[PDB]
From a paper:
Although a previous study suggested that the RAC-ribosome interaction changes with ribosomal rotation, our data clearly show that the Zuo1 lever arm anchors RAC at the ribosome with two main contacts (C1 and C2) that are maintained in both RAC conformations independent of the ribosomal rotation state. In RAC-2, these interactions have disappeared, and straightening the MD-elbow moved the lever arm by up to 40 Å on top of protein eL22, which fixes the ZHD hinge by two internal loops and its very C terminus. Finally, adjacent to C1, a weak contact between H47 and a single lysine (Lys268) is observed in RAC-2, which is lost in RAC-1. Although at C2 the contact with ES12 stays invariant in both RAC conformations and throughout ribosomal rotation, the tip of ES12 adapts by a 15° bend in RAC-2, independent of 40S body rotation. The tip of ES12 thus moves by 15 Å. Noteworthy, in RAC-2 the slight detachment of Ssz1-NBD from Zuo1-ZHD (moved away from the tunnel exit by 10 Å compared with RAC-1) already opens this weak contact and provides access to the tunnel exit.
Here we determine cryo-EM structures of Chaetomium thermophilum RAC bound to 80S ribosomes. RAC adopts two distinct conformations accommodating continuous ribosomal rotation by a flexible lever arm.
Numbering used by the authors:
A (entry chain D): 9 to 434, 439 to 480, 523 to 566, 571 to 577
B (entry chain C): 3 to 298
The structure:
Amino acid sequence: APGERVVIGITFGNSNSSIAHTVDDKAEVIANEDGDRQIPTILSYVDGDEYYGQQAKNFLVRNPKNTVAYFRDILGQDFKSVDPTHNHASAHPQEAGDNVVFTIKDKAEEDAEPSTLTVSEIATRYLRRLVGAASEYLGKKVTSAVITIPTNFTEKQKAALIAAAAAADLEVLQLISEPAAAVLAYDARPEATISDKIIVVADLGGSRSDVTVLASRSGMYTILATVHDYEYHGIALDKVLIDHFSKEFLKKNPGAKDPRENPRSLAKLRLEAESTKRALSRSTNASFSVESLIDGLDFASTINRLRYETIARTVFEGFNRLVESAVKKAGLDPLDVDEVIMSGGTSNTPRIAANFRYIFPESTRILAPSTDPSALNPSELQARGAALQASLIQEFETEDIEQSTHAAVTTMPHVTNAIGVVSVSEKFVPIIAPETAVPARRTVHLDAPKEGGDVLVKVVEGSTHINVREKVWKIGSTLAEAAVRGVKKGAKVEVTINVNTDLTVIVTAREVGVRGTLS
Amino acid sequence: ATVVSLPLPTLPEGWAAEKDFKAIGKLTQEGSSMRTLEPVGPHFLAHARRVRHKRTFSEDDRIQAQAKAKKIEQDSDSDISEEEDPMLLARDAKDWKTQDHYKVLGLSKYRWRATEDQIKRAHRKKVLKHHPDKKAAAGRADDDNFFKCIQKAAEILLDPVKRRQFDSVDEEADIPPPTKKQLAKGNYYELWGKVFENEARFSKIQPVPGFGNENSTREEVEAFYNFWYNFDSWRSFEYLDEDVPDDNENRDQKRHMERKNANARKKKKAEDNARLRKLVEEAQAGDERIKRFRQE
Ligand SMILES: Nc1ncnc2c1ncn2[C@@H]1O[C@H](COP(=O)(O)OP(=O)(O)OP(=O)(O)O)[C@@H](O)[C@H]1O
Ligand SMILES: [Mg+2]
C-alpha cells in the first residue's frame, strides 16, 4: 500500500552492492549482519546453505562449483552479448534457449544432483537476501526500493531487473542513474547550495569505469556526455600487484612454481593484493603476506604507496585520456568545468584525485575524500542518493511515477547560445546561462555609470571562446535594447531575463522600471 | 539574484522608444536544442507536477519523435569489424612478438592511422566472439590460442609509447620507392608525391610540405627541399630488443645486455637516417623544376 510502503535505496554494481535509508531526511547507509556497508555482490553455497557478502567472498577456496560472482552484467543479456571474462573463475554460463544459466550445487544432500539456476534466479535470491538484511536492520519488513543503474542498461535489462525484484517480492518505484544519485547525495544535503555548475561524475569501480558530464542549472541537471570503459580498473590494479609480487616471490625462492598458473594460488593472491591495496589506500605503507603459497612455502614482504603508484602509473594516464576524451565528446574545455565528483571505491586513492587537481584548473572543485573536507564516501554516494529518492517518492502513486518518468515531462528545447548584456567601460556579461531548460528567469545586479543618469541595457546573445589558455565571451546577434532614466550615481540596476516555454523573452531593467517583450 | 561589480553602458544621446524598449532579435529553434532530462530530484518532481497539471496523461509516443530528433544513443556497428579470418591466421598459431598484430584485430584498412576508440571496440568484439569460456566449450580447445593472440595484441597496442614503438619498428605499411623503369611510366610528380606523405609521419612539425606538381612555385620547391633535408625523426627500434631469461638476476649481466641492445639501437637509427637521406637525394636528382627555374 502506498501509505504503508517501506522504501530503501539500493546500489547494485558488478563488484559490490549497498543499501541505504533516510533518517530525518538524511541518508544513512545500512550495515548488514557482517558489519559491511559495501557488501560484495557474490553468492556462495556450502552444504546446501546459502551464503552472501563477505562469507561468500571468502568461500571461493571452499567451493569451486558453488560460487557465483560478477553476474550483474549478464542480467537481461543474450548469450552472444554476455562476456564471461570476469566470470571465468565462476560457473560457466550454459546457453539454454536465450537465457544462459549457472550450474551449482545448492541442495543440502551430498549425493544430490546440482541445480541449474538461471541468472534471473540468482539476481532474485541476491536481492531477496539484501532486502532481508535491510528488514532485520530496520525491524520492519522492507517492501520497496529505488535501485541505481548505469545509463547503458537496455530496456531488456531493465525488464530483467524488475522481474528479479518482483520474484524477490520487491517493487521498484524507479531506476536512477548512479551519476544522478551521486549528485543528489550532495545537492540534497542541508548545507548544499544550488547553482549552475558543470559536474563530472567519475565512478571508478572494480570491473568498470564511468565518466559522465552534466550541466546543473537551477538545481536541475542535463546530461551532456557519458563514456564507459571496461579496460582500466581495480582488477587491473590488483593484477599489476599480483605480477609484481609473483616476480618477487619467484626470485626470492629459486625453483618455485609461478603461483599465477594455480587457481587457488591466484585467488589467494588477488584477495591479499586487494587487502594490501586498501591498506595502502588508507596508510602510506602496506604489508603483504600469504602463508603457504604452494608446497608449504610462506611469503612476506612490504610495499609503499609510492611504489604502488609507480608500478600503476600507466592506468593514471589511461584515466586522464578517458577524462579528456569525455570532455572532447561533450565539446567542452577543462576551463568550462566547475566540479568533478570522484566516486566509487577506487576513488579513495589520493593520487588519482591529485592527478585531476593537476589536470584541471584550481577554480574547479574536485569532490574527493582526499581533496575536500566536506566530501562524502564515494562508495556511499549512489546508495544514499537512491535512498533519498526513495524517501522523496515513497508516497506517490504508481501512476504518478509512471507519468512523471515519461518523455513528455523530461523533454524540452534547450536554448543553445547564452543570453547576456553588454558592459562597456571608458564585454559580455551572461545572465541566462547556456543550454537553458524549460522556462528560465535569471537576475543580475550591475553597477551604474560613473554619474549614472540615463543608462542603456543592451541584451545580446553570447558564445564561449577559448583564447591561448583563458576563456572569453564573444558577442553575437543583439536581442533587445532598453533604457533606465535617471539612475543614481553608484546605484545598482537589477536586470531580469525570462525565457518562457512559448519562446517569449521578457526583459526587465529596474534600478534599485522598464519592461519589454520579444515574441 | 547575482550581484556583479561591472558597469552598464551610458545611454546615447537622442535615443528613445515606446516604453524605453526596443526589440531587435528573437530566439530560434536553431538557437535552441532538445535534450531529455533524467527523472530524478525534488525540483524534477515539481516540474512533473506542473506537467501533469498542464497535460495530465503524457504523450510519450507523440514526443518520441521530438526526443529522437536531437539525442545520442550507443552506436553498435560491427559491420566493419566482421572483416574476414582466412585459414584462421595459421590455425590459431601462437608465437610471442613475431606475428601480425593488425589482422587479428581487423586493422589492415587503418593500420597506423587508427583511433583508440575503434581499437577498444574491436578488442571487445573479438573477445566476445573468441572468448575461451564463452565459445571454446564446444570442443574448441585451441580457441584459447587465438584468444591469446587477441590478448597479446591488446597489451602491445594498448599503451601509446609501446604501440608507437611497434609501429616505428615494423609497421609493414610502406610503399617501396618507384625506382623501377616499368614503374616510371606515369606522372613523375604524382609517383613521388605519395612516398613523402607516406613516410612524413615521423616529422616534428605536424604541417609538412608535400612536394607538388609541375606548376609548383619556386618558393614551395625551396621550402619542401629544405624541410626534408633537415628532418628530425622519432623512429625507434627498441621493440627488436633481445629478450632475457627470467632466471637471470645479476646486475652485471643485465647491464651488459642493456649496453649491447643500446648500441644495436643506435646502429639501426643511423642506418635509417642514411636511407632517408639517400631517398631525398634521388628525388632531387630526378626533379626538373630546378632546371626550369634556372631557365627563367
Ligand atoms: N575503502 C576503499 N579504499 C580503496 N579502494 C576501495 C575501497 N573500497 C573498495 N575499493 C575498491 O574500489 C572498487 C569499488 O568501486 P565501486 O564502489 O565503484 O564498485 P561497485 O559499486 O562495487 O561496482 P561497479 O563498478 O560495477 O559499479 C573495487 O576495485 C574495490 O576493490
Ligand atoms: Mg560503482
